[PDB]
Ligand binder design. Structure first.
Ligand SMILES: NC(=O)c1ccc[n+]([C@@H]2O[C@H](COP(=O)([O-])OP(=O)(O)OC[C@H]3O[C@@H](n4cnc5c(N)ncnc54)[C@H](O)[C@@H]3O)[C@@H](O)[C@H]2O)c1
Length: 177
């Protein structure tokens, strides 16, 4: 459950997203309230109260990914994916991914770790999230091969099913290429 495409390393990992080390860790929030949701909470606790200040002070809107520093996370930046409510969810994911990965070229990011975005509450189906997540990652690997990137998909330990889907999607993908 890891593979290298050109200058891109991609790994599936069972752990907590807020306990990661990477240039960038991806948050997943409702923009009206970043104190709600599994990932948003984990991150808010770990990163500390000062993370919610820079976040409320920099929303001021079509911004799909808000960027902050990492505070007490072992990261340089946090990319907060903002799920706005007036959009198709599979499209928000697909667009939030590309932006997050484009920002990786913008900020000379070498490593980025993402949770299983959009699987919360069964909003996007597990295989579809995985389909989309790999889709965009692989796209980037082909379209910007000059940029070295380590991408982790962090799956929560108890979420065995989500894990089984990402393995399978990765398997499927490597069978090509
Ligand atoms: N308004 C909506 O219709 C809508 C749609 C999508 C997302 N959202 C917002 O985003 C969140 C839900 O979407 P999501 O799926 O990106 O987020 P989430 O916070 O529910 O987590 C999504 C997935 O990541 C897993 N996960 C990975 N690492 C984890 C960790 N360290 N702790 C806990 N869970 C972890 C979760 O169990 C789940 O499978 C909520 O905050 C919600 O407001 C809202």
């Amino acid at each position: 459950n890891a593979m290298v495409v050109n200058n891109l390393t991609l790994q599936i990992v069972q752990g907590h997203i807020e306990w990661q080390t990477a240039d960038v860790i991806v948050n997943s929030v409702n923009p009206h309230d970043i104190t709600v949701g599994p990932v948003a909470k984990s991150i808010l606790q770990q990163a500390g109260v000062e993370m919610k200040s820079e976040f409320l002070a920099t929303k001021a809107r079509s911004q799909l990914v808000l960027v902050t520093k990492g505070f007490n996370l072992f990261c340089k930046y946090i990319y907060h994916v903002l799920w706005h409510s007036e959009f198709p969810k599979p499209q928000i994911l697909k667009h939030a991914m590309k932006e997050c990965l484009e920002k990786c070229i913008e900020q000379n990011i070498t490593s980025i770790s993402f949770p299983a975005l959009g699987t919360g509450n069964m909003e996007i189906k597990k295989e579809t999230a995985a389909e989309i997540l790999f889709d965009e990652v692989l796209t980037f690997a082909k379209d910007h091969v000059k940029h070295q990137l380590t991408v982790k998909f962090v799956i929560f330990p108890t979420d065995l099913e989500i894990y089984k889907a990402f393995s399978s999607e990765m398997a499927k993908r490597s069978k090509m290429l």
